[PDB]
Symmetry: C2
Subunit: 161 residues, 2 copies
Amino acid sequence: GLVELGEKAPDFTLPNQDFEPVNLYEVLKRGRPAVLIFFPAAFSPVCTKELCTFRDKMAQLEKANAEVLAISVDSPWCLKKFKDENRLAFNLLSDYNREVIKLYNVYHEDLKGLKMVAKRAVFIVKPDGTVAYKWVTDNPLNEPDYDEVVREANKIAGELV
Amino acid sequence: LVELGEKAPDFTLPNQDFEPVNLYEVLKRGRPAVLIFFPAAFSPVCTKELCTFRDKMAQLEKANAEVLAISVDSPWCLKKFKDENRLAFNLLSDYNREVIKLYNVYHEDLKGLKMVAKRAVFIVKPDGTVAYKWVTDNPLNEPDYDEVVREANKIAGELV
């Protein structure tokens, strides 16, 4: 149940904010790396800061032509409002039933009395499905190193040529 | 599990600001409590003819009673919902699905989303007595807020 570096990323299907099924392997078949951003909660201070920082660096991410998939346990309805309010130009996926967080081993048993919330984590998956980058924090106040995520995603894109 | 005329089981849940709210502390203030369960903040409501995202829970502010709105959404999502709709009452998060099991007001599966609150209304007297109960198996079916205000004002009136 551990998603190690160089290992194949487990496939999953999740509804996005508009209730459309998004499958990781179908995304990878497009030929661009996938950036999986797990976050504890829509509308929380750090998650809003995190998704807005990735939005402000979208142009740098679109150079690498990378697919960004942000994931939390919030409903697609909550995720739709959160995407619209922040002008997020990528898909937010609902792991409402806790299947994906258990699969990627990125969950908090308890956060502020809320059970089984996603940990803040970032994975970069190559088109062949191998995990090329894994960042997981036990403290949700910590933010990923954005510039390094964008740099590593761009490095995969350039290596694909 | 929870019948009209019997004692409403007590519970404590965090509100939109993470402040714990206990049902019996609320009742102790001496006014009935109106419990409104709802599946999801920012989700649509439908009649036989109109489907909208316009939530009408704000009409319950008129009731001479304390209003407690409950969904399984996080307190952060509930804070956004409370602020958008300018709701003057507490929104409680049953994130861990304990209150919906207790009041037996849950959908096993709604559009692939497991253990979601049914649309429901309980009017509880200060002594703990369930003086009004309305439950629907249709997650889109909003209660008649004017009838809830009507029953709540009546229940608060009978109070001796």
